[PDB]
Ligand binder design. Structure first.
Ligand SMILES: *C(=O)CCCCCCCCCCCCCCC
Lengths: 184, 146, 212, 158, 179
């Protein structure tokens, strides 16, 4: 009924439970630091594992988002982007990414951020400039969650403040809205 | 509160499992001696036992080395429990006795529980003794700070 | 009122991220020894068969996974005093405060922050060691295998309980008592009667035994 | 009162089933009975076939969904979510608006105990041969059954 | 405001779907045929689904009767007087689908004894309990209009589309009085 911005502004202040953002950052940084320090210092096979982590988080977390908000099924990328960029992130991470870089005839979009709480004051060692993204759990969550609402897409970073870009950005390219299953 | 001075639990086969004391160095021997004497006090018709609703019955047995020894037996498990208290620290009130038998019931419950299977890698007797010592620290060496 | 004048993140996402790290530990161990993203595919076990495998794992396997998770928890607890919610606002310093007050801190404020509530009662002997209890223990209040499986539940769960022992065996370190000196083991224990019934079948305990 | 409770998922097979029959709270609660699997398929066929009508003859850009199906004897209340979970319930009359209850059943008794339940799995596909609509592995989450029965016992007034 | 009505002759198969909207005409004719067929399938499949609590004992043949409401229709042909019927009448589809509630509309059913089905789609969500009585009363009214103006007609084969004029221009006034 209400606009999706208000549906999210009126729930973040009313019915949630809250903690410290840089506490959450320290926890995530501890996890990814243990990933880096565990095995062979390799920055390629940590990316896929953080992607997998995010996949499990999102696949288990989508059920909560609908439960608290109760949106309908999303059909087109426009409404999907509006939803996940002005109510979902507002509920979870208290950030409001705005959309940019629509492609031809709306086959994809891109999220852009400058206040990512998954790593705020996390200027990192010089070694990480090639393979480690440090926020791969976010894109894992996006793909895993969106896989559960029947729309199939692949998500991946393009830019990040940490590796020395302007603002961080994620591409969300859709593949096919798979049909619902029939009993037969 | 009542502070037990030594606790001892024995099975049917007269096998000392645990003669734990709270915290002098050489008094552990004296508690061992008194526990064995209390074990001697049991197998006999010198004093009555049970025959009261088929329930266990706490009773004082003897006093030596300046510590009074209370004892208790379980008919349907073979469990033989005995605790000694500092003589000077016991006033002898009815409420005091009502606290002592409650202590006996509690320690019996803890031992019966710890004897159960779960969270035991192999049911090792060393681990069982260690756990029982830990819980007998819990019961009598607690303070409940705010 | 400075406590609430800082940004926040949802306790739901934080709790679930905190939860699925036993799956992280088992997964990283099995990677050490068909979903397409990058034209080479990535496989994964779906975060519950990993639990079931860790339950039916070998002894050395389980010990290694628990050590890894404990290392994670130690990293969580190391930087908790430099965290910018205790350094400035609350009026408890960190000069020395030998024992007692430090455990009051970790027991009262750290648990209120990391988990959703203040602790239940603790116990002390004043010599070296402290006992901590919690009857509900929020981050696992929704785990249950099956109706008449009231034995495998605790076995499957006890890997998760090795994180708060991590923070406890952490924050003592870097504030004055090191890992070799401090030993602490987390274990299960049933709740008292006069508490609501269907929170969890049992409470939980911690056995900090810093040597001094 | 309520006659029975059924949960379905996107893989078109019932997850949880519970019919009370007798008026008592602790009535013949044949929880996850194999006896009523035919009824489960039958009811899912009803709801799926009849959802298409309102899915077709919608207006605007709302893409609506059913709320209730009535008949001579009983009355059906359904909640359908973007996750594909259906929360069908068979009940009687003299309770006119009821969707609040199903939103409650989704809010903090399914996610609180079925999707915050790392021991238990998410929607029970298990790599083909069940996800098409014929196989069956059901939910048996002890907490879910216990708190669900406790919460729904007052609503079986008979 | 009943924005649409339609009918299903005896075994599925639409025969009349004059939709009383201002201007939508989104749904094509062939789609409504499949709609009616699946709706008849829902009636066929709904019978053997009742919960076991009531099947063994009904003890409820007092509520099946429908109360009468005086002037739901207007403000005639074979009938005369102010109104079609006054005596309180009885339900027939004792174990069939009756109502269908959604966010955007509400659909009511009246099943004739022989098998004719009358469907009424209204945008107005009538407290959803008395709405059944209102819908059944109005549906019997249009059913009487049908029995008058569709069957006392030579150029009308049985169970075929209703290509009438008096029927539609009369049910139009019938609905328009009901707002
Ligand atoms: C229409 O139904 C589409 C809904 C949009 C998908 C829901 C996205 C929720 C996940 C947001 C990210 C949460 C934080 C993850 C990192 C810990």
């Amino acid at each position: 009924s209400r606009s999706l911005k208000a549906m999210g502004e009126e729930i973040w202040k009313n019915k949630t439970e809250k903690i410290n953002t840089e506490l959450f950052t320290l926890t995530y940084g501890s996890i990814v630091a243990q990933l880096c320090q565990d095995y062979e210092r390799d920055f390629n096979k940590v990316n896929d594992h953080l992607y997998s982590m995010g996949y499990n988080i999102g696949c288990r977390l989508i059920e909560d988002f609908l439960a608290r908000t109760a949106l309908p099924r999303c059909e087109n990328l426009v409404k999907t982007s509006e939803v996940l960029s002005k109510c979902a992130f507002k509920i979870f991470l208290n950030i409001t990414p705005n959309i940019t870089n629509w492609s031809h005839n709306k086959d994809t979009f891109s999220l852009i951020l400058d206040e990512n709480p998954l790593a705020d004051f996390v200027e990192l060692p010089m070694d990480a400039m090639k393979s480690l993204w440090y926020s791969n759990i976010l894109c894992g969550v996006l793909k895993g969650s969106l896989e559960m609402v029947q729309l199939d897409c692949d998500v991946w970073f393009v830019s990040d403040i940490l590796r020395g870009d302007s603002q961080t950005e994620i591409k969300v390219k859709l593949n096919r809205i798979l049909k619902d299953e029939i009993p037969i | 509160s009542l502070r037990p001075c030594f606790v001892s639990l024995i099975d049917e086969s007269d096998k000392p499992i645990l003669i734990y004391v709270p915290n002098e160095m050489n008094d552990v021997l004296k508690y061992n001696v008194l526990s064995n004497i209390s074990l001697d006090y049991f197998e006999s018709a010198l004093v009555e036992w049970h025959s009261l609703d088929s329930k266990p019955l706490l009773k004082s047995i003897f006093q030596l080395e300046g510590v009074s020894v209370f004892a208790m037996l379980i008919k349907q498990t073979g469990l033989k429990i005995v605790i000694g208290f500092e003589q000077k620290s016991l006033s002898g009130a009815d409420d005091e006795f009502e606290a002592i038998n409650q202590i006996f019931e509690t320690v019996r419950k803890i031992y019966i529980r710890v004897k159960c299977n779960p969270l035991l890698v192999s049911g090792d007797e060393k681990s069982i003794i260690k756990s029982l010592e830990r819980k007998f620290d819990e019961l009598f060496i607690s303070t409940e700070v705010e | 009122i400075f406590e609430n004048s800082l940004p926040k993140v949802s306790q739901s996402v934080y709790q679930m991220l905190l939860n699925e790290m036993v799956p992280l530990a088992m997964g990283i161990e099995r990677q050490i020894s068909l979903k397409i993203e990058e034209h080479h595919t990535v496989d994964i076990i779906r975060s519950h068969n990993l639990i079931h495998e860790l339950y039916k794992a070998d002894e050395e396997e389980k010990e290694k996974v628990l050590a890894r998770l404990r290392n994670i928890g130690f990293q969580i607890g190391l930087k908790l005093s430099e965290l910018l919610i205790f350094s400035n606002n609350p009026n408890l310093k960190f000069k020395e405060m030998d024992l007692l007050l430090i455990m009051k801190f970790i027991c009262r404020d750290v648990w209120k922050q990391i988990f959703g509530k203040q602790i239940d009662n603790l116990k002390t002997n004043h010599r070296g060691t402290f006992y901590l209890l919690d009857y509900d223990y929020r981050p696992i209040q929704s785990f249950s295998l099956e109706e008449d499986a009231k034995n495998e539940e605790l076995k499957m769960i006890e890997p998760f309980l090795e994180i708060p022992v991590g923070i406890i065996r952490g924050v003592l370190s870097s504030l004055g008592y090191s890992s070799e000196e401090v030993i602490c083991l987390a274990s299960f224990i049933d709740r008292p009667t006069d508490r609501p019934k269907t929170a969890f079948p049992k409470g939980v305990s911690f056995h900090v035994q810093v040597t001094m | 009162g309520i006659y029975s409770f059924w949960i379905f998922d996107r893989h078109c097979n019932c997850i949880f089933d519970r019919e009370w029959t007798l008026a008592s709270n602790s009535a013949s609660g044949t929880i996850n009975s194999k006896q009523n699997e035919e009824d489960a398929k039958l009811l899912y066929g009803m709801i799926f076939s009849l959802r298409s009508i309102t899915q077709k003859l919608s207006k605007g850009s709302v893409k609506n969904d059913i709320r209730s199906i009535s008949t001579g004897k009983y009355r059906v209340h359904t909640y359908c979510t973007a996750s594909g979970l259906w929360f069908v319930l068979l009940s009687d009359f003299k309770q006119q608006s009821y969707t609040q209850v199903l939103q409650y059943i989704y809010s903090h008794i399914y996610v609180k105990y079925v999707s915050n339940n790392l021991l238990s799995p998410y929607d029970f596909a298990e790599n083909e041969n069940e996800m098409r609509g014929q196989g069956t592995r059901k939910i048996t989450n002890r907490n879910f059954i216990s708190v669900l029965e406790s919460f729904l016992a007052p609503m079986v007034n008979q | 405001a009943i924005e649409t009505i339609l009918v299903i002759n005896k075994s599925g198969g639409l025969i009349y779907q004059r939709n009383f909207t201002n201007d939508e005409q989104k749904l094509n004719s062939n789609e409504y045929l499949i709609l009616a067929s699946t709706l008849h399938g829902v009636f066929a499949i709904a019978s053997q689904l009742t919960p076991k609590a009531l099947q063994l004992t009904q003890q409820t043949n007092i509520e099946n009767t429908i109360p009468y409401i005086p002037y739901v229709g207007m403000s005639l042909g074979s009938f005369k007087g102010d109104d079609f019927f006054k005596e309180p009448f009885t339900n027939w589809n004792k174990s069939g689908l009756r109502q269908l509630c959604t966010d955007q509309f509400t659909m009511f059913i009246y099943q004739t004894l022989t098998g004719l089905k009358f469907v009424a789609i209204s945008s107005s969500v009538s407290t959803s309990n008395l709405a059944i009585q209102i819908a059944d009363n109005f549906l019997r009214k249009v059913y009487c209009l049908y029995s008058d103006y569709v069957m006392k007609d030579p150029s009308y084969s049985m169970e075929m589309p209703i290509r009438s004029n008096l029927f539609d221009e009369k049910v139009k006034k019938m609905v328009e009085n009901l707002q």
